[PDB]
Design a protein around this motif. Structure first.
Motif, PDB file in Angstrom:
ATOM      1  N   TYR A 168     -28.210 -20.011 -17.546  1.00 38.18           N
ATOM      2  CA  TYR A 168     -29.391 -20.827 -17.299  1.00 38.18           C
ATOM      3  C   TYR A 168     -29.253 -21.963 -18.296  1.00 38.18           C
ATOM      4  CZ  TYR A 168     -31.655 -16.256 -16.018  1.00 38.18           C
ATOM      5  OH  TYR A 168     -31.962 -15.022 -15.513  1.00 38.18           O
ATOM      6  N   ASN A 169     -29.312 -23.219 -17.857  1.00 38.11           N
ATOM      7  CA  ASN A 169     -29.218 -24.400 -18.735  1.00 38.11           C
ATOM      8  C   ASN A 169     -28.024 -24.345 -19.689  1.00 38.11           C
ATOM      9  OD1 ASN A 169     -32.570 -24.919 -18.477  1.00 38.11           O
ATOM     10  ND2 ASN A 169     -31.220 -26.689 -18.581  1.00 38.11           N
ATOM     11  N   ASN A 170     -26.846 -24.346 -19.107  1.00 32.59           N
ATOM     12  CA  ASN A 170     -25.668 -24.742 -19.860  1.00 32.59           C
ATOM     13  C   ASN A 170     -25.598 -26.255 -19.751  1.00 32.59           C
ATOM     14  OD1 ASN A 170     -23.264 -24.990 -21.172  1.00 32.59           O
ATOM     15  ND2 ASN A 170     -22.072 -23.871 -19.667  1.00 32.59           N
TER      16      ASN A 170
END
Lengths: 49, 51
Positions: A45-47
């Motif tokens: 999630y949200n790299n």
């Protein structure tokens, strides 16, 4: 078996009087058949990198 | 003011600037030879055979 030097994360020993077909079996089970734990699935999630 | 003609000129001197002397040196100046590669000093066996 004559252990020469053993410390953390290393080992060097002898095996006097064993033929290549058992010694190679020990080598080839150390490299590819002795099991471990390792990361297989990753859940991102949200790299934003 | 009549401007009569004259005879034939014998020779024609040509004035011109001289050759560039003392421009080139009497020995030649080459680019020096790039050196052959040296074995560097301080080379030793860093790999010991295991066990």
């Amino acid at each position: 078996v004559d252990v020469v030097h053993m410390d953390e994360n290393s080992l060097e020993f002898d095996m006097v009087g064993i033929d290549a077909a058992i010694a190679n079996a020990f080598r080839r089970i150390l490299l590819a058949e002795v099991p471990t734990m390792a990361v297989e699935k990753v859940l991102v999630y949200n790299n934003t990198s | 003011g009549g401007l009569t003609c004259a005879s034939a000129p014998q020779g024609t001197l040509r004035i011109l600037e001289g050759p560039q002397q003392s421009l080139s040196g009497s020995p030649l100046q080459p680019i020096p030879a790039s050196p052959p590669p040296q074995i560097p000093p301080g080379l030793r066996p860093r790999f010991c055979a295991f066990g």
